[PDB]
Nucleic acid binder design. Structure first.
Ligand SMILES: [Mg+2]
Length: 580
DNA sequence: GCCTGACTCGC
DNA sequence: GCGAGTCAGGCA
């Protein structure tokens, strides 16, 4: 059953065809500065396996890799591109990425290897990576005969499956979406990840010194009040101290045991002095372990940078994801937490960090897709949307909007932007489910078009089996017809939410592509570093700030044209923090 | 070592 | 709600 291929000990010209399936295998989960364990090429002249030491030292082969006119089909081309970049080799000519094509067709499948993509088209002549490399501590690179057999099979799979995947994409009107958005974005993200973001480790260290000392003062206080020592970080042990020794009221339960969540503890504070200290300890400990120690661990001692990996094929919404480290959840709301952004600094001297973000892009998209007259008018006037929503659902004038009136209208808007349940809204507002439902009806009276959109979208999801975004991204909702309430409700909310959330993802992605083209046209040394959902972060020389202030907002605003304007704020400073 | 749940951050 | 990550406690 062993597939036929040539185990080459040198590169020959028939391997350098102008159309091929290419596999550049990087087995380590984190591909930055990682090894390339083997290469496989499949083309019209046959199947070949090449060793990396041979192939990546061959001037002919490396030229072929870098020749854009030489077309290549791959799975997860960003992985290969970046790993080759740490070796000083460019990858060009990728006209088809099977990971990304599988992702656009159905993100639900969770395709993470060639074998999983292949199964979609009834192709099983390839093994899953987990079956070949193993998993966990047992994860090893197998012997050359096995390795080579596996890579050729993945290449043959890519070679066979290109055509059927492009055909379905074509039928779904997702062919441009792959060739003009997702694949070009791959390249951009590859540069961003390679560039990395410079970190002030000393700053982080002296921060970790401050927390350390504070945690110790707070850890002791907790024991004194507890009258003993326990692991505060153990929900089970804390629950015994709180709810048995101190006899505190049990407000919420967990399948595991007593609930020790901040929202619960917030209400227990009045009963005992130990409660506020525990809250304080957890946030300090959250900050210390997730963002100080976690960050320091992934900083490269050589470059003194952090090189994230963006997962472009994970979410069902279409948003990018970030790992090792996740830079999309760096603390902002609390001042103690915000100061973590001071540690991110420009990669060169006399450079500054530049941040641009969309202002309420999700609500603006909603106005566009729903065509609500009132919501559209509100953004055309560039009103404070939250204050305006408070004016309508409480039937009062701007002078009359109290801070609490605005906080609650904000929560309702938030529930729409993220698709939370009425049960969700009530928990957030610390109010009854019935009142929460009352708020929503009240919002729909003020915003008839959105109500209309919610009704119509759910219906469409039921009729077609999926919902789409502005740029033709697609999400299937099988549980829409489910006869179980909670399951059906989630599916309805995802039907409502994805077109809003997904379309915003679409717009930022097209802006990244447009911005990259303009940066190049303008001959600016400025470069994309990060993407955090609503915002793009850049670094550039201070001499470019004035040009970028004008330039970067313009590109983001003109990415797509909607029925309402798009608004972008920008800032810049000596640190990411300072770009506020 | 391997899972899992419980908890918390930004969006 | 999502997604990422840390920690504990129960497991083979
Ligand atoms: Mg914003």
């Amino acid at each position: 059953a062993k597939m036929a291929f040539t185990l080459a000990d040198r590169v020959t010209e028939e391997m350098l065809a102008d159309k091929a399936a290419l596999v550049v295998e990087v087995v380590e989960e984190n591909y930055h500065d990682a090894p390339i364990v083997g290469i496989a090429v499949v083309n019209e002249h046959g199947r070949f396996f090449l060793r990396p030491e041979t192939a990546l030292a061959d001037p002919q082969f490396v030229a072929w890799l870098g020749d854009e006119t030489k077309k290549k089909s791959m799975f997860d081309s960003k992985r290969a591109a970046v790993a080759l970049k740490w070796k000083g080799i460019e990858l060009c000519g990728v006209s088809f990425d099977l990971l990304l094509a599988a992702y656009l067709l159905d993100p639900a499948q969770g395709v993470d290897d060639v074998a999983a993509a292949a199964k979609m088209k009834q192709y099983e002549a390839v093994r899953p990576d987990e079956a070949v490399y193993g998993k966990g501590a047992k994860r090893a690179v197998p012997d050359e005969p096995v390795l080579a057999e596996h890579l050729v099979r993945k290449a043959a799979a890519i070679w066979a499956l290109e055509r059927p995947f492009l055909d379905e994409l074509r039928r779904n009107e997702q062919d441009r979406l792959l060739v003009e958005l997702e694949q070009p974005l791959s390249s951009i993200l590859a540069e961003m990840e390679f560039a990395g973001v410079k970190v002030d480790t000393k700053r982080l260290e002296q921060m970790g010194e401050e927390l350390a000392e504070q945690l110790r003062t707070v850890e002791q206080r907790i024991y004194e009040l507890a009258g003993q020592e326990f692991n505060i970080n153990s929900p089970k042990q804390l629950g015994v101290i709180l709810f048995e020794k101190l006899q505190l009221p049990v407000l919420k339960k967990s399948k595991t045991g007593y609930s020790t969540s901040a929202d619960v503890l917030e209400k227990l504070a009045p009963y005992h002095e130990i409660v506020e200290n525990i809250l304080h300890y957890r946030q300090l400990g959250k900050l210390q372990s997730t963002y100080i120690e976690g960050l320091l661990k992934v900083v490269r001692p050589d470059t003194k940078k952090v090189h994230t990996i963006f997962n472009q094929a994970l979410t069902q919404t279409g948003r990018l994801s970030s790992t090792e480290p996740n830079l999309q959840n760096i603390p902002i709301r609390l001042e103690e937490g915000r100061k973590i952004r001071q540690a991110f600094v420009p990669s060169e001297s006399d450079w500054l960090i530049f941040a641009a973000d969309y202002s309420q892009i999700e609500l603006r998209v909603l106005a566009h897709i729903a065509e609500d007259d009132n919501l559209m008018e509100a953004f055309r006037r560039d009103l404070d949307i939250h204050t305006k929503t408070a004016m309508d659902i409480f039937q009062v004038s701007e002078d009359e909007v109290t801070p609490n009136m605005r906080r609650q209208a904000k929560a309702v808007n938030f529930g729409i932007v993220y698709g939370i349940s009425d049960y969700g809204l009530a928990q957030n507002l610390n109010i009854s489910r019935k009142e929460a439902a009352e708020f929503i009806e009240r919002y729909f009276e003020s915003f008839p078009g959105v109500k209309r959109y919610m009704e119509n979208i759910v219906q469409e999801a039921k009729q077609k089996g999926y919902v789409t975004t502005l740029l033709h991204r697609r999400r299937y909702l099988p549980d829409i017809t489910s006869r179980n309430f909670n399951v059906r409700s989630f599916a309805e909310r995802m039907a409502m939410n994805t077109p809003i959330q997904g379309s915003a993802a679409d717009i930022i992605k097209k802006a990244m592509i447009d911005l990259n083209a303009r940066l190049k046209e303008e001959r600016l040394q400025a470069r994309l570093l990060l993407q955090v959902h609503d915002e793009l972060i850049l670094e550039a020389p201070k001499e470019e700030m004035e040009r970028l202030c004008r330039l970067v907002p313009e590109v983001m605003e003109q990415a797509v044209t909607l029925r309402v304007p798009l608004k972008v704020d920008y800032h810049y400073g000596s640190t990411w923090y300072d770009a506020k």
